[PDB]
């Protein structure tokens, strides 16, 4: 998926 926010702000390819 595609965060824009945390939690996804780690090194996490959802981190888009």
């Given amino acids: 998926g595609c965060?824009?926010?945390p939690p996804c702000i780690?090194?996490?390819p959802?981190?888009?």
């Fill in 3 to 5: 965060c824009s926010r």
């Fill in 10 to 12: 780690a090194n996490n």
């Fill in 14 to 16: 959802d981190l888009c």
